[PDB]
Structure formats: C-alpha cells, structure tokens
Amino acid sequence: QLHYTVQEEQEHGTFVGNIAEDLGLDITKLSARGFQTVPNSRTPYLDLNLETGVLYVNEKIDREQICKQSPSCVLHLEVFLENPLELFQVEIEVLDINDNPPSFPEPDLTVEISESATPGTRFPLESAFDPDVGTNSLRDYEITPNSYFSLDVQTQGDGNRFAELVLEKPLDREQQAVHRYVLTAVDGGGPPQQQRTGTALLTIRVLDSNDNVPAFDQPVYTVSLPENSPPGTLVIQLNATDPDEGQNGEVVYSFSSHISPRARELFGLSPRTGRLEVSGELDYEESPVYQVYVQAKDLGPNAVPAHCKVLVRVLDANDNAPEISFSTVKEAVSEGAAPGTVVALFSVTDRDSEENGQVQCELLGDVPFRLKSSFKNYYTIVTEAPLDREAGDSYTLTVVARDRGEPALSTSKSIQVQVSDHH
Amino acid sequence: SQLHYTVQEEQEHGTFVGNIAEDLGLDITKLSARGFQTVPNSRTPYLDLNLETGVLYVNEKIDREQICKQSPSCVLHLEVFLENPLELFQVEIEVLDINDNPPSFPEPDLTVEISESATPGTRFPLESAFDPDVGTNSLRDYEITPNSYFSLDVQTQGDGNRFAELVLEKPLDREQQAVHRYVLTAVDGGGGGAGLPPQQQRTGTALLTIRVLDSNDNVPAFDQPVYTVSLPENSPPGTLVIQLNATDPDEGQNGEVVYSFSSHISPRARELFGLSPRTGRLEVSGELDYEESPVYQVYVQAKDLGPNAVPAHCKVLVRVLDANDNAPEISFSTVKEAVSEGAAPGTVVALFSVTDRDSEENGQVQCELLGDVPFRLKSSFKNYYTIVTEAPLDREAGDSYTLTVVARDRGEPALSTSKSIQVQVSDHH
Ligand SMILES: *[C@@H]1O[C@H](CO[C@@H]2O[C@@H](C)[C@@H](O)[C@@H](O)[C@@H]2O)[C@@H](O[C@@H]2O[C@H](CO)[C@@H](O[C@@H]3O[C@H](CO[C@H]4O[C@H](CO)[C@@H](O)[C@H](O)[C@@H]4O)[C@@H](O)[C@H](O[C@H]4O[C@H](CO)[C@@H](O)[C@H](O)[C@@H]4O)[C@@H]3O)[C@H](O)[C@H]2NC(C)=O)[C@H](O)[C@H]1NC(C)=O
Ligand SMILES: *[C@@H]1O[C@H](CO[C@@H]2O[C@@H](C)[C@@H](O)[C@@H](O)[C@@H]2O)[C@@H](O[C@@H]2O[C@H](CO)[C@@H](O[C@@H]3O[C@H](CO[C@H]4O[C@H](CO)[C@@H](O)[C@H](O)[C@@H]4O)[C@@H](O)[C@H](O[C@H]4O[C@H](CO)[C@@H](O)[C@H](O)[C@@H]4O)[C@@H]3O)[C@H](O)[C@H]2NC(C)=O)[C@H](O)[C@H]1NC(C)=O
Ligand SMILES: *[C@H]1O[C@H](CO)[C@@H](O)[C@H](O)[C@@H]1O
Ligand SMILES: *[C@H]1O[C@H](CO)[C@@H](O)[C@H](O)[C@@H]1O
Ligand SMILES: *[C@H]1O[C@H](CO)[C@@H](O)[C@H](O)[C@@H]1O
Ligand SMILES: *[C@H]1O[C@H](CO)[C@@H](O)[C@H](O)[C@@H]1O
Ligand SMILES: [Ca+2]
Ligand SMILES: [Ca+2]
Ligand SMILES: [Ca+2]
C-alpha cells in the first residue's frame, strides 16, 4: 500500500505521487492493463493520470473542512490493473497549515467576583478554539500584566489546554469596582509557519460585601447647651460613614445599652439621620452633665455595631428666685428698746449656682430698723435709732432678696411687729 | 452657734446623736427658763430633741437611700433657739452610708447577638449594674466566667459611673458553637472610715447568652476533586451518571447549594448531559456513542445562595464502555465480470474488504461464502478477501453464477451483513 503526503491549500495540478513508478508498472503497458481508479474511492481532491500513473492535486484541499479537528487526515484512493487482476491502495495524507488564528467564543467576557474572594480562588473561563491541529492548534493564554490576577493553564492529555483566573491579592470594591484587562490566546506555529493570536476583552465586576463598619470621626463629642433648652433643640447631628453599597452602606442609629433611663427620657435620636435632639426639660439644678451612648449599625448581614459617646454639658440659667424663710419674730418690741435690739431672724436660699445663686438683700422703707448678718445666709432685723411710734402702734417690715443673675430675680416677705409696754 | 454631728443610717430609735447642751455651754437647769426650742421650719421626723437635757437622739430610722438617693453628701439641717436673749443655733447632722444594698442588674437575663465574622478586639456594651449606696459601697468592678472568647473591659467616667463591655478575644465560629452561656457578676467595694463598723462586699448576678449570628464563611465542598464513572454506550437518557453531594454547614441560603456546569465544559458534554441545579443529580440527556468518543469530561461548579458566595469546582470523568452496536460493512473493490469455462483452480473472481466500527471482538469480522459452490475464499491480508475458483464449474455456456458473502462479527448478540454479485461464464477457444 502506497503512502504520499500533500499540504492543504495546494493549487490545481500539484504533484502528489508517482504511482506507476512506485508500483513497478511500466507506462507503456498501463493502457493495455486497464490502469484505472476504483469506482468507490474517487475523490474530487485527487486526479490520477492513467497514461503516466501520476497522482496530482485537482481541487484544492482545505483540511479544516474534510477532517475538521481530527488529529489525522488521510484520503483513501484505490487503483487497479487487469489481466491479471491486481488492486493497489494509495493513502494521501493531508498536512495541516496554520491558516486560522485562535478565536474566543465571546468577544467580551464579564465575570463577577465577590470582593471577599480569597487569593488563590480560581475562576473558570471558556477556552478559545483554533481549528488547526497539532502544533498549529491552541498553545497558551496570556493576560495583561496586573497585580490582582494571574493565569493558570493546564493540560490533561488529549492535546487540550484549559485556563482559569487566579486571584492574586484581595479585591476591594470600595476602591475599584471594575477591572478591565485584555486576554489573548496564541497557537504554536513557529515553509516556515507564523504564530497567530486571538483577543478578547475581560471585565471583572467586583461584588460588594458588608466589609466596612460605620465610622464616627471621633469617639467622643462634647456639646454645651443652656438649661431649659426647648425640646427639639439640636444637640448634635451625628454622621457615621459606611462606604459599602446598598443596605451594606445604609446606617441606622440607636442608643447603646449604657444610657441612663434619665437620658433616654431627656433625649431623642432619629434612627436614620443621626439627629440627636432634646426631648425633655434640662434642669441644671438636677444635673450639670449627661452622657449619651450611641451605637450605629448598617442594615446588611453580619453588621458590626460602632459606638460613640456624646457629652452634654448643661449651662446654668437664672430660673430660680430666692427663697426667704423666717425662723423667729419677736411678738412685740419695748418702746424704749435701745439700738441693736434684735426683732427677728431669717435666712435666704437660691436654688441656682454661681452668680445666679448669690443674693443681696435689703430692707425697704425709711424705718428705724437695719439688717445685720451673723452667719452665712443668716440675717437679723435690728434697731438702728430710737422708735418713731410708741405703745400700741405696730410696724410691718418687708424685706427684698435679689439674686445676681441676668435678668436678676427677687422675692419679698413681710412681718408684723408691735410696740408694747416695758415691764 | 453651729454644730456638727454624724450618725449611721439605719440606727434604731433612741440612738444618741449629740449633746447640744454640752456642746453649746448651756446648763440644763436654765433650759426650761430660756425657752429652749426647735425652730418650726427645721423640724424633722428623724430627730427627737430632749429639751430638758439638750440631747439629740434618733427618732425615725434613717434610710439614706431614700432622703438623699445617690448624693455623695447627706446632711439633715436642724435649728434650735433660746429666748431672752434670742439666740439661734444651727446643727448639721451628717448621715453616713453603710453597705446595706447589693449591686443589681436591670434584667436577670441578657441576650447579645454577635456575628461570627466579628473581629477580635471588638467591644460590645453591656447593661451596667447599679448600686444605690455611695462611695466605696457603690459599684466597684465586673467579672465574667473565665473563658477564651470574651474578656471584660471597665471604664470609669467619674461621678460614680462605671461602664463594662465584652471584649472579643478570639474569632467566633457559629458552625462549631452557636451559643455561649456565662455568668456575669458585679461587686461593690466593701472589703477593707468615719467610725463605721466594717462593711462586707455584696455581689449581684445576671446570666449572659451570646448568640452567634451566621455569616457565609463556608464554601461548598466535594469529598473528591475528580469523580470517574463508567457507563455503557447508548445508556438511555435519564440514566444516572452520578449524584453529586456538595457540603455547606452554613445556615439558610448560606447553606443552600445550587449546582451548575462549569464554563470550561465542551458544548458536546452540555448537550449529552443534564445537571439538576438543586440536587446535583448528573444524568445523561443524549446518546453516548463510544465510537464517537470513549470518555467525556464534565466540569461542575457548586455555589451557595448567600452573599459573597464562593464557587467550588469538581470534574467528572465519564468512561464509555463499548457495545456491539455496529454491523460489519462489506465493500467489493473489483469483480471479474466474466470467467472462462476452462478456468483452472485458483482463478481469482473477486476482491473485497470488510470493516466494523466497533472495537475488539465487536469489531472482529469473520467471513463465509454461502452455498455449495465451486468457489472458495482466500485472504492475503486481514479483513481483505478474494473469491477464487476451486473445481470445475457445474454450469457452462450462458449461465452466470451468483455469489453471496456473509460477514459476521464476534459480539453478543453478533451482527452480520451480506452482499452478492453475479458473474457470467464465457466461452474460450
Ligand atoms: C456624612 O459624611 C459623609 C462623608 O464624609 C466624608 O468623609 C470625611 C473623612 C471627609 O472626607 C469629608 O470631606 C467627606 O464628606 C458626607 O458625604 C459627602 O461629603 C462630600 C465631600 O466629600 C460632600 O461634598 C460634595 O461631594 C460631591 C461628590 O459628588 C460626586 O463627584 C465626585 C467626584 O466626581 C465622586 O467621587 C463622588 O463619588 C460623587 O459621585 C461633589 O460633587 C460636591 O462638589 C460640590 O461642592 C464643591 C465645594 O466647593 C463645589 O466647588 C462644587 O462646584 C460642587 O458644588 C461636594 O464635593 C457631599 O455633600 C456629602 N454627601 C455625599 C452623598 O457625598 C455627608 O455629607 C455627611 N452627612 C451629613 C448629613 O452631614
Ligand atoms: C451529602 O452527605 C451528607 C453527609 O452527612 C455528613 O457529612 C460528613 C460530616 C460525613 O462525615 C458524613 O459521613 C456525614 O453523615 C448527607 O447528610 C445526611 O443527612 C441526614 C439528615 O440529617 C442524616 O440522617 C440522620 O441524621 C440524624 C441526625 O440529624 C438530626 O437533624 C435532622 C434535621 O434537623 C433530623 O431529621 C434528625 O432526626 C436529627 O435530629 C441521625 O440521628 C440519623 O441516624 C440514623 O442513621 C444511622 C446510620 O448508621 C443509624 O445508625 C441510626 O440508627 C439512625 O437510623 C441519620 O443519620 C444522614 O446521616 C446524613 N448522611 C448520611 C450518610 O447518613 C446528605 O444526605 C448527602 N446529600 C445528598 C444529596 O446525598
Ligand atoms: C499573535 O500576536 C501576538 C501580538 O499580539 C504575537 O506576540 C504572537 O507571536 C502572535 O503573532
Ligand atoms: C487581538 O487583538 C489585540 C489588540 O489588543 C492584539 O494585540 C492581538 O494580537 C489580537 O490581534
Ligand atoms: C460577692 O460575691 C463575689 C463572688 O461571686 C465575691 O467575690 C465578692 O467578694 C462578694 O462576696
Ligand atoms: C449572684 O449570683 C452568683 C451565682 O453564680 C454569685 O456568685 C454572686 O455572688 C451573686 O450572688
Ligand atoms: Ca485551510
Ligand atoms: Ca489549517
Ligand atoms: Ca491556528
């Protein structure tokens, strides 16, 4: 059985092989001997010159069409002679050239990767296809040099290579949500054959994970407000930051566990805006400061609460007037009671603090009495000169206590004293 | 004028508070004359003043927690006076706090949810205990059952306020333990001060439950990276190839697995096989033709339904088993149209060949020439045959003999094919 070879894409009339010579048949006897092609093995790709016995290319051979991706390509032609009957088989092997580049199934590839993918995780890609065979078939892949992905190609026999993306370093959607690289595939064509290349754009969409915690610029905020600040007064507009996407980045504010029930009464916090406002009466006299404990938390899965603390210092106002309290009053005074005779003792108080709780007091009128002070917050009503009126006539003394605030506040109180007869 | 006394809270009626007469220099014989009396404004149900001796005794028992709450200072202000001459005296009575109250938690049972992906060092605020006593008798410290996952952090903010928080010491794993239970205790500072009998330390308690919230931190896992299955060709569609089993100990959608074809699979495998998304059941959906290909590579990925799901991959190697599903094919290349009557034994009459697309015995072919004819079969090569003469032909002149050949393969059941040609005998000088 005879063996010949022929390249694909040879033009009409190309020599394939000399059957007459290779079979020991002299050309002068071929016509007599009935040299002819067997009916079954006729092929439009080969012409057999019967008077010379030479096999030439007739119609051009495209190996990709007759043999597709078969690793072997053989046209089977049969010739025969008569008297005596002799049959000869002729195999014509079609050799592959590299007239096709590798090609990708999709021009644009998009692959979605969670930003929490671990380095070393692999992401499969549809391999490119090259219709040539052997060394002219697919050889290797390459990707744009980058810091995030490398390429892994592996062959498991059967002349095939498969590639998958290898994550090199963690991704962060909050810094870059889309990567675009160029992916290329080359065959092994190296008369001399040249290497061909195919290309596809590659888009990596980084999928969000709830990997960012809400964040306050500082752990403690200090705010100062005047007492009696009306409810609804703005305490502070908190702002937590969470660069995540969707529910992962939406922040809701709430009170922490530590908050006193008193502060929970005195303050209101709107969950979504972070607006901390007054909702009760701030009484400096009750307490000069309050500690508000807040937590913020996003609405995604695995959310981690963040915490901050608002220090609310109350500023004292003058909202308490002095209180006078008389401890004793002498029923009556002797008419000839010499100067300095005590008539009554009393005290003053002011629920405020600092200037607002410091009080100056005065006795009103043009009366023969003066005010003396033995102790702190203690006063005495004394005589100053002899007495205008005697015996039955009574006096009514009124004292005014006034604090040192702005505006100032004052209170008054009266007592009835009378002149009797000296015993 | 001004006097200072001290008294323990919770002293019984009649306890001595102070001798006002002595401390003021007043003789008791003149007290009745001088009008020794308490100022109306400063009367208090907590103190009785014996006017003929000038001694202050406890009257109604004092509970410091009630009158002064948590003030660091507690002072009852009493006023007394004498007449002729009018003299007023101020008396401050300091109530000292004892440790007659334990720390207490607002709720006996506390529940806190913590993501298993919480970072070690993260702190979780805890509902603080309250001690109504003041100073050293108030809240001092918190303690938790010793463990490896959580420690306690205390922070003092002044004004008798103390904050406790759980500190995550090491990562949590819901798949291994979803709930931790600890005992939480809070103690004040009565262990060691103005003449008070030594105080003992009191303690309060609350149970602590840590519920670990699930995170999608487990990837589906195949017990093997490659599975190999052998099946006979033409196994009917729906035939079971393999039942995959992805493992994902997570909870909910994090633990619900869906299966799919990987991107590398040849489209031929996608046509010939069907994979059920939820169960992982891989079955045949087309005709498996060994002669087309003896093996197929199915590349699968499994992936859960939670956020940030990470795909896992496996590879199924399906080896096809050859059956006898191809009958031999006979092909005559050339046949002598006529053979002379006077043909001696051995004259060749025909040539042909046989093929069988099967393999091994299923592709092994034996040949037979049918009938009781004067011809015989010869073989120069394997699967190549010649039809020759054997003896003198019974027929002569015009009659043409017709010959049928039967090719039979060696499978079970075996398969065979036939082909015949008729050639005429010619006459020779
Ligand atoms: C809660 O906090 C939010 C975040 O706080 C940030 O974090 C800290 C650490 C600082 O960096 C601070 O500066 C940040 O604000 C806060 O968010 C946003 O803060 C920005 C400023 O960064 C505010 O200003 C405006 O930002 C927009 C962004 O628009 C787009 O364009 C850029 C660039 O193309 C993109 O990168 C973005 O992704 C956006 O898609 C600007 O367009 C805008 O420009 C205008 O202002 C300047 C000022 O001179 C003018 O000259 C220009 O002509 C424009 O008129 C500002 O730069 C922004 O308002 C604010 N919101 C958002 C949604 O960004 C947020 O305000 C805080 N919340 C509350 C209630 O306070
Ligand atoms: C994929 O493989 C799964 C393998 O399961 C485990 O995975 C790892 C850890 C390997 O070590 C493997 O060996 C393990 O078995 C397979 O999971 C199968 O799940 C079922 C359902 O739970 C198991 O059946 C029974 O489990 C219970 C305990 O489960 C409790 O919870 C469920 C649901 O909440 C309740 O329904 C139960 O009532 C329980 O409350 C066992 O109590 C029970 O014991 C019986 O079986 C043993 C077998 O020897 C007998 O000795 C006993 O007498 C009982 O008759 C069952 O075991 C099942 O065990 C488990 N796997 C296997 C192999 O049994 C899953 O099915 C696979 N998926 C697919 C699609 O194939
Ligand atoms: C295909 O094209 C690339 C350049 O894009 C070459 O490097 C390669 O050798 C082949 O010619
Ligand atoms: C596909 O296209 C790219 C363009 O970047 C070439 O570099 C490559 O050789 C192929 O032609
Ligand atoms: C209360 O109880 C605790 C133990 O739970 C002690 O440590 C403490 O001293 C007080 O007795
Ligand atoms: C609360 O209960 C616990 C029980 O574990 C004690 O140890 C503690 O002293 C307090 O009585
Ligand atoms: Ca071609
Ligand atoms: Ca080619
Ligand atoms: Ca090629």
Ligand SMILES: [Ca+2]
């Ligand atoms: Ca991130």
Ligand SMILES: [Ca+2]
């Ligand atoms: Ca994110």
Ligand SMILES: [Ca+2]
């Ligand atoms: Ca977030």
Ligand SMILES: [Ca+2]
């Ligand atoms: Ca006030």
Ligand SMILES: [Ca+2]
């Ligand atoms: Ca005030």
Ligand SMILES: [Ca+2]
């Ligand atoms: Ca005032």
Ligand SMILES: [Ca+2]
């Ligand atoms: Ca008490």
Ligand SMILES: [Ca+2]
């Ligand atoms: Ca007490």
Ligand SMILES: [Ca+2]
């Ligand atoms: Ca206590």
Ligand SMILES: [Ca+2]
């Ligand atoms: Ca886990």
Ligand SMILES: [Ca+2]
């Ligand atoms: Ca989990």
Ligand SMILES: [Ca+2]
């Ligand atoms: Ca999972």
Ligand SMILES: [Ca+2]
């Ligand atoms: Ca078959």
Ligand SMILES: [Ca+2]
């Ligand atoms: Ca077969």
Ligand SMILES: [Ca+2]
């Ligand atoms: Ca067969």
